[PDB]
Amino acid sequence: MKITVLVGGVGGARFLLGVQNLLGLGSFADGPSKHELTAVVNIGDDAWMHGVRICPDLDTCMYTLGGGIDPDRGWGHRNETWNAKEELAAYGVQPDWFGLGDRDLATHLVRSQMLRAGYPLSQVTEALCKRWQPGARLLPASDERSETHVVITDPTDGERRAIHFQEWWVRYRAKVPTHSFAYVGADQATAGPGVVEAIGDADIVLLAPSNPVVSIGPILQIPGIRGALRSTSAPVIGYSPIIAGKPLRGMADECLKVIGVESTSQAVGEFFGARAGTGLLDGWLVHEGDHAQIEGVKVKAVPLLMTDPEATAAMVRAGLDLAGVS
């Protein structure tokens, strides 16, 4: 009755909604349910901005599962203003690095106050979730700092520099040469409380169809997490993030391009690799029409579009079935 999903970004929050819908959790619950859902959440995008600690992936899961996301825009709070961001721009600090809405900042004020008072991020999340009540256990992949940076050629002096992923995404992406990722702090981090337990005891471990390099990937750089994934008796089912068939055939993933990986279901599959060898996957699900073949990994094409909680629920069901878990 126990599911563990590794998540990051808007895509990860959407996948958890599918999981909740399938198992009657959170907003989809009718009576109190038979299953518990644990999310291991990326902290690679977390940063200190304007003296406050911002954790996007944990916040997006928490807001999404708590029913706080504006349905029209698809991100942020309902009835959101950006007045504090406006005054910051007048002050001269750069505030486009993250949405930084007024309602959003309240979360940041509360979290930063707890962190300064000695509460670890996992407990900070528990405290916020008492209000949001997402219907899932949102575990930060670590309580220690592990921030995704991008190494660029700085155009002001030609030097290699690491830039926080969020600054790279708004300002430098596609505008200067970019050489690699750095996981600043990862080597000094331990897996967050209950993360290795959640991976160890699960009936199944699901990799949401999030960005492989910068959403799932950074979770894997946290010491101990990869080991828990390679050892657990639970089947490990991955979902491909590559959806073909778009107008003009789509665009390659920019973060995959940094590490030189093609934007195909086959390449992302090899990226995570086979548990039978040195990799992470037992199963790899791809969208209708797509193909992959990887020595040791069971691949199945099924509809992989998170159109709505009901479509996402079907996708989760295809994961359980391919694992052989009920």
Ligand X SMILES: Nc1nc2c(ncn2[C@@H]2O[C@H](COP(=O)(O)OP(=O)(O)O)[C@@H](O)[C@H]2O)c(=O)[nH]1
Residues found near its own copies in the complex (CB under 8 A): 50-52, 77, 79-81, 83-88, 90-93, 102-103, 105-107, 109-110, 112-113, 116, 128, 130-131
Angstrom distance (rounded) from CA 164 to CA 301: 35
| Chosen from its own copies, ligand X, Ca ion, none, partner binding at 91 (C-beta under 5 to 8 Å by type) | its own copies
| Chosen from ligand X, its own copies, Ca ion, none, partner binding at 196 (C-beta under 5 to 8 Å by type) | none
**Nearer residue to Ca ion within complex by CB, 43 or 204:** 43
**Nearer residue to Ca ion within complex by CB, 216 or 292:** 216
Strands (E), the chain: 2-7, 36-41, 47-49, 52-54, 137-140, 147-153, 160-164, 178-184, 204-207, 236-239, 283-286, 298-301
**Nearer residue to Ca ion within complex by CB, 48 or 89:** 48
**Nearer residue to ligand X within complex by CB, 167 or 253:** 253
Residues found near ligand X in the complex (CB under 6 A): 7-12, 57, 209-211, 215, 239-241, 243, 248-250, 252-253, 304-306
Name residue 285's beta-bridge partners. 239, 300
Main-chain dihedrals φ then ψ at residue 138, nearest 5 degrees:
-100, 100
Chain residue at closest Cβ approach to ligand X: 9
**Nearer residue to its own copies within complex by CB, 106 or 252:** 106
CB of 44 to Ca ion, least distance (A): 7
CB of 58 to its own copies, least distance (A): 15
Strands (E), 154-291: 160-164, 178-184, 204-207, 236-239, 283-286
CB of 60 to ligand X, least distance (A): 6
CB of 246 to Ca ion, least distance (A): 6
Angstrom distance (rounded) from CA 259 to CA 116: 36
Angstrom distance (rounded) from CA 303 to CA 293: 18
| Chosen from Ca ion, ligand X, its own copies, none, partner binding at 188 (C-beta under 5 to 8 Å by type) | Ca ion
What stretches of 66-171 show up as alpha helix (H) in DSSP? 83-91, 102-116, 121-132, 165-167
| Chosen from its own copies, ligand X, Ca ion, none, partner binding at 79 (C-beta under 5 to 8 Å by type) | its own copies
Q: Is 321 marked as a binding-site residue?
A: no
Closest CA to 218 of 7, 2, 10, 1: 7
CB of 289 to its own copies, least distance (A): 44
**Nearer residue to its own copies within complex by CB, 119 or 169:** 119
Angstrom distance (rounded) from CA 103 to CA 69: 12
CB of 157 to Ca ion, least distance (A): 28
User: Where is the binding site, in residues?
Assistant: 59
